[PDB]
């Protein structure tokens, strides 16, 4: 519940270049070149679709191979 030495936790308890990236590039217009001068079940369905939301809002330390065989 908050520290004495604040700078070490804002990084610990937790980009702007990509924000600045779209800023000059994408915000800029017509460049370049220039011219002079349903309690639980419902909850579950919604969450699955949403999960597809967040996972589809973004995008490597793991790899899974899967296979079928006998015992």
């Amino acid at each position: 519940t908050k520290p004495l030495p604040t700078a070490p936790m804002a990084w610990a308890e937790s980009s702007p270049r990509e924000l600045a990236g779209h800023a000059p590039l994408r915000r800029v217009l017509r460049p370049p070149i220039a011219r002079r001068d349903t309690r639980a079940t419902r909850d579950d369905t919604e969450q699955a679709v949403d999960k597809i939301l967040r996972g589809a809002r973004r995008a490597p330390r793991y790899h899974l191979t899967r296979q079928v065989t006998l015992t």
Binding site: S15, P16, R17, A20
Partner: protein
């Protein structure tokens, strides 16, 4: 559409000729590049402050 001239004597009579050509557009590009740095990346975003 092309011009024409009437001529006399035995010859084949001339008929106006119209040509119908068609050029096709080409494709190019231009490259520039700029770089950043490890320190800059850290400075541009909040990392090293």
């Amino acid at each position: 559409h092309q011009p024409l001239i009437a001529r006399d004597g035995p010859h084949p009579v001339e008929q106006p000729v119209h040509n119908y050509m068609t050029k096709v557009i080409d494709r190019r590009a231009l490259n520039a590049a700029f770089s950043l740095a490890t320190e800059a990346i850290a400075l541009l975003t909040g990392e090293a402050l």
